[PDB]
Design an enzyme around this catalytic site. Structure first.
Site, PDB file in Angstrom:
ATOM      1  N   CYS A  24      -2.252   8.395  -6.473  1.00  9.35           N
ATOM      2  CA  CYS A  24      -1.817   6.846  -6.171  1.00  9.35           C
ATOM      3  C   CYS A  24      -1.106   6.187  -7.336  1.00  9.35           C
ATOM      4  CB  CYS A  24      -3.230   6.121  -5.575  1.00  9.35           C
ATOM      5  SG  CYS A  24      -3.679   6.648  -3.961  1.00  9.35           S
ATOM      6  N   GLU A  30       0.455  -3.211   0.813  1.00  8.00           N
ATOM      7  CA  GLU A  30      -0.237  -2.269  -0.270  1.00  8.00           C
ATOM      8  C   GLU A  30       0.653  -2.016  -1.661  1.00  8.00           C
ATOM      9  OE1 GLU A  30      -3.041  -1.557   0.201  1.00  8.00           O
ATOM     10  OE2 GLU A  30      -3.584  -0.266  -1.457  1.00  8.00           O
ATOM     11  N   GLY A  62      -6.093  10.896  -7.542  1.00 12.23           N
ATOM     12  CA  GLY A  62      -5.188  10.908  -8.779  1.00 12.23           C
ATOM     13  C   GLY A  62      -3.737  10.634  -8.649  1.00 12.23           C
TER      14      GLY A  62
END
Ligand code: TV9
Length: 182
Positions: free
Chosen positions: A148, A72, A146
């Site tokens: 990340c 990720e 908001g």
């Protein structure tokens, strides 16, 4: 308010930009030279906005572990006219647990935001939005959309970037020194 918030602020004030993709606005950590990181779900393309300036992407790599499992983290090299302060010496070398972390966010929606999240667990495996993901850190704070890309720090260490939550817990992808050797 205290030395944890001091280290977090020092990182935010010199090593962050606001990154915009077609998937939204993200906190983006600059690590060294023109190299930054962002959650892979930002879907970085050939062009990105950096503090509202159209910027060519010279390289983008979605990291995976040697089991070919999602981490990720996307590493982005930006066609920017300015280098970041080199902070690679504040990156951990190994997977670990931590005490007393701060999550720091800077976007249009959440400027100058700092959250004391407490103890950070080396959680490991997470099914993140249906994607099997490794090297996940967990903290017991109800993090929200908001956040990340937000930077996770301790005193002395930059340990991760926020990639998701379940409404009660928040999850960060580890940053390791070995991702940024050249
Ligand atoms: C104490 C300070 N620490 C930071 O900047 C943290 C935010 C990374 C510092 C001063 C001089 C040389 N290195 C580090």
């Amino acid at each position: 308010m205290g030395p944890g918030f001091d280290f977090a602020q020092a990182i935010m004030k010199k090593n962050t930009v606001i990154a915009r993709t077609e998937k939204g606005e993200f906190t983006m950590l600059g690590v060294y030279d023109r190299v930054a990181v962002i959650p892979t779900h930002a879907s970085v393309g050939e062009i990105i906005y950096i503090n509202d300036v159209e910027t060519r992407v010279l390289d983008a790599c979605a990291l995976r572990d040697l089991t070919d499992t999602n981490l990720e983290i996307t590493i982005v090299k930006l066609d920017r006219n300015q280098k970041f302060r080199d902070i690679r010496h504040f990156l951990p070398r190994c997977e670990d647990d931590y005490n007393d972390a701060v999550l720091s966010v800077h976007t249009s929606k959440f400027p100058n935001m700092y959250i004391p999240v407490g103890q950070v667990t080396n959680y490991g495996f997470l099914n993140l939005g249906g994607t099997p993901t490794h090297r996940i850190l967990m903290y017991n704070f109800p993090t929200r959309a908001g956040q990340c890309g937000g930077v996770v720090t301790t005193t002395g260490k930059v340990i991760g970037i926020h990639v998701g939550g379940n409404g009660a817990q928040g999850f960060a992808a580890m940053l390791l020194h070995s991702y940024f050797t050249d």
